[PDB]
Amino acid sequence: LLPRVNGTPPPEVPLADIELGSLEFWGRDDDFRDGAFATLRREAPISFWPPIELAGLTAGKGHWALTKHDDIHFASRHPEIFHSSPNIVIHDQTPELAEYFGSMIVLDDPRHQRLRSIVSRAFTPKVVARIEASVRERAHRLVAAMIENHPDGQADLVSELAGPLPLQIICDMMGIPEEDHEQIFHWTNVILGFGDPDLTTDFDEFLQVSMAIGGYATALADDRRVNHHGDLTTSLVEAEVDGERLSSSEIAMFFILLVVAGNETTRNAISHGMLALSRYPDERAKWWSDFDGLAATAVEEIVRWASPVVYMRRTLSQDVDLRGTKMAAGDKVTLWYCSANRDEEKFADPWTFDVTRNPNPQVGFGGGGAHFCLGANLARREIRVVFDELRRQMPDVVATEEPARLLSQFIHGIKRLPVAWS
Numbered sequence: 210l211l212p213r214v215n216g217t218p219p220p221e222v223p224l225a226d227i228e229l230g231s232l233e234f235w236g237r238d239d240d241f242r243d244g245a246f247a248t249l250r251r252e253a254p255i256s257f258w259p260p261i262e263l264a265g266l267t268a269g270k271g272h273w274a275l276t277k278h279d280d281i282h283f284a285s286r287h288p289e290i291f292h293s294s295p296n297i298v299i300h301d302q303t304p305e306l307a308e309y310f311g312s313m314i315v316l317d318d319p320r321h322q323r324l325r326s327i328v329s330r331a332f333t334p335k336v337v338a339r340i341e342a343s344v345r346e347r348a349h350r351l352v353a354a355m356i357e358n359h360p361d362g363q364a365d366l367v368s369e370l371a372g373p374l375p376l377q378i379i380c381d382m383m384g385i386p387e388e389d390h391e392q393i394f395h396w397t398n399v400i401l402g403f404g405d406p407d408l409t410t411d412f413d414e415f416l417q418v419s420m421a422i423g424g425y426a427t428a429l430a431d432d433r434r435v436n437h438h439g440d441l442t443t444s445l446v447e448a449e450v451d452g453e454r455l456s457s458s459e460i461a462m463f464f465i466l467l468v469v470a471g472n473e474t475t476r477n478a479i480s481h482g483m484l485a486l487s488r489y490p491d492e493r494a495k496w497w498s499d500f501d502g503l504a505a506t507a508v509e510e511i512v513r514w515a516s517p518v519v520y521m522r523r524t525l526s527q528d529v530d531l532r533g534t535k536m537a538a539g540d541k542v543t544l545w546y547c548s549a550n551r552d553e554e555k556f557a558d559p560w561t562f563d564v565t566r567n568p569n570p571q572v573g574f575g576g577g578g579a580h581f582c583l584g585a586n587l588a589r590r591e592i593r594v595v596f597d598e599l600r601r602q603m604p605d606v607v608a609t610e611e612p613a614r615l616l617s618q619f620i621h622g623i624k625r626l627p628v629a630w631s
């Protein structure tokens with residue numbers, strides 16, 4: 210809709226106008242948000258902010274915002290100081306289920322290392338090969354369904370493609386039958402929508418669906434203990450590292466992590482990638498003329514530009530002094546990947562969406578280290594394949610309206626993105 214010039218810096222946002230602890234700030238467009246973190250990186254690279262308070266329930270204590278690329282990298286490579294426990298968000302609303310929803314992402318070593326090592330062993334060559342074919346199969350069918358279901362040539366990219374694609378791939382690797390997709394999608398959408406303030410989500414309904422998807426996953430894992438199949442669920446019950454195996458409860462907790470951390474992340478990377486290729490058509494023309502050649506750099510820039518995960522929280526176990534800022538033990542620390550992927554000291558011309566950007570030390574998958582995104586390369590494959598099928602079946606697809614943004618501090622979400630093709 211609105212015309213954009215590639216390489217346009219964000220507006221000058223004064224420091225007095227930045228309120229990271231107010232929900233009003235997170236309702237602004239990306240230009241004001243980018244300009245706010247740009248002012249932070251320049252004038253207050255590490256500052257303390259209160260949490261977002263909804264009038265009524267508790268809010269918790271504040272957090273130190275790390276906006277520089279080096280500070281986020283330093284915090285990611287020192288997990289003994291920046292703990293991932295109890296959780297990785299600013300305020301956990303259900304701390305008794307922190308490990309039930311989080312699985313390995315809320316654990317520290319050695320508990321994190323033992324759990325991740327066994328899960329990584331379950332991704333055998335046979336399981337990965339099925340996952341790769343599923344990415345191509347699902348992306349091809351979803352794009353082809355867009356053409357059939359919309360003879361008018363107009364559709365919403367989120368509901369038709371960017372939404373179901375990451376979750377259908379997760380259901381395929383877990384061996385979930387096609388008839389059970391209705392339950393898995395509904396259960397996941399209620400879980401994701403529970404954080405959305407715009408959608409009234411009943412807390413009692415949130416607990417019911419969280420236990421239902423957990424019971425479905427434990428029963429799915431128990432079924433694979435008797436009936437071997439070529440899915441990830443079977444390999445999860447058979448994987449063993451140093452005599453340690455996974456219980457059905459642990460597998461269910463990992464499945465609940467995937468339907469969130471491995472679902473809405475890739476979704477918003479696709480939507481923002483389509484929005485970037487639409488606002489800067491010279492980049493879509495470059496990639497379309499040499500897709501397999503520019504795919505690696507284009508996917509990496511889409512992740513840097515989108516930054517689907519806005520931040521990740523850490524908890525200090527000891528006192529820290531970085532850039533003259535003295536942070537005490539027990540304080541919360543938030544690693545703002547949205548700001549690090551625009552760091553002027555790390556990226557030349559950071560406001561240019563360049564599908565050929567090299568080098569690209571982007572931290573959209575995190576700053577590296579122990580908790581580095583387990584499905585980072587799978588996410589890269591999902592981004593490349595979905596834009597490959599769009600290039601083949603509807604090469605002129607383009608966004609025709611400004612996106613409907615998700616009101617979130619943790620997810621750079623797009624709720625609706627109208628697109629059109631010929």
Ligand code: HEM
Nearest residue numbers: 313314471474475478518573574575580581582583584588
């Ligand atoms: C654009 C897509 C994605 C983005 C931007 C993303 C982002 C992230 C980030 C920022 C972290 C935390 C890194 C850290 O704390 O240092 C993470 C962890 C994780 N991601 Fe992703 N992710 C994506 C897709 C996926 C997919 C497709 C999967 C699985 C199929 C996945 C599975 C995981 C898991 C299991 C963890 C926790 C690993 C651990 O705690 O050791 N992610 N992701």
